[PDB]
Amino acid sequence: FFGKFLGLYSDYFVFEVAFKPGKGANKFTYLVCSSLGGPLTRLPDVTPAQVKASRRIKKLLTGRLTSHVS
Amino acid sequence: VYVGWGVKNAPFVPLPPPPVAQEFAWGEVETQELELK
Amino acid sequence: QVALMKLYKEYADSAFNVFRGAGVDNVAAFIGQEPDTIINQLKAYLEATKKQKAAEAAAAAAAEESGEEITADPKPHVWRFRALGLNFGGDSLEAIEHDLKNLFAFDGDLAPGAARDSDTSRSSFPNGDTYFGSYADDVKHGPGLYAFATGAGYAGEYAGGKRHGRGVMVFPDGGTYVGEFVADKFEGQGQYRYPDGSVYTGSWAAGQKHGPGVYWDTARGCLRGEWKKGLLVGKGTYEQPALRFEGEFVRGMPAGTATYTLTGHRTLDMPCFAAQHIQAEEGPTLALPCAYGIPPGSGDEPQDKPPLPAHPKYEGLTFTAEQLPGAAPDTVFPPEEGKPVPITAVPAFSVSTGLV
Rounded-to-integer distance, Cα C356 and Cα C340, Å:
18
**In contact, C122 and C131? CB cutoff 8 Å:** yes
Q: Where are the beta strands (DSSP E) in C61-147?
A: 77-82, 118-124, 130-136, 139-140, 142-143, 146-147
d(CA C209, CA C214): 10
**DSSP strand pairing (A11-17 vs A3-6):** antiparallel
Contacts of C83 (CB under 8 A, 6+ apart): none
By CB atoms closer than 10 A (0-12, 13-18, 19+), residue C107 is buried
**In chain B, whose CA is at the least distance from the CA of A59?**
B7
β-bridge mates for residue C163, sequence order: C158
| CB-CB neighbors (< 8 A) of C265 in chain A | 68
Find, in chain B, the residue whose alpha carbon is nearest to that of A3.
Answer: B2
- Separation of alpha carbons C191 and C195, rounded Å: 13
Q: Are the Cβ atoms of B3 and A1 closer than 8 angstroms?
A: no
Strands (E), C233-304: 234-240, 243-250, 253-262, 286-293
CA distance C349 to C336: 13
Beta-sheet pairing, C176-182 with A11-17: unpaired
Task: Determine the residue type at A32.
Answer: V
**Chain A residues in contact with C270 (beta carbon < 8 A):** 9, 62, 64
Partner-chain residue, chosen from B11, B21, B37, that has the shortest CB–CB distance to C114: B37
| C133: phi then psi, degrees, rounded to nearest 5 | 165, -155
Inter-CA distances, C129 with B18, C14, C105, Å: 37, 8, 12
Enclosing H/E stretch for C27: helix C27-30
Number of C-beta neighbours around residue A29 at 10 A: 15
Q: Are C222 and C338 in contact (CB under 8 A)?
A: yes
> Collapsing DSSP states into helix, strand and coil, what is residue C150?
coil
Which chains are within 8 Å of A by 3+ CB pairs? B, C
- C318-320 and C326-327: which strand pairing? unpaired
Mutate to test the interface with B, among C49, C182, C198, C226 (most CBs of B within 10 A): C198
Resolution in units of Å: 3.0
Total residues found in chain C within this entry? 356
- Return d(Cα C161, Cα C208) in angstroms, integer: 21
CA nearest to B8 within chain A: A58
Strand partners, C298: none
Taking the C-alpha atoms of residue C116 and residue C21, their distance in angstroms, rounded to an integer, is 27
Provide the experimental method for this PDB entry: cryo-EM
Contact (Cβ atoms closer than 8 angstroms) between residue C156 and residue C173: no
| C-beta of residue C249 within 8 angstroms of C-beta of residue C234 | yes
- Classified as helix, coil or strand, A53 is helix
Q: Give CA–CA dist A59/A2, Å, rounded.
A: 20
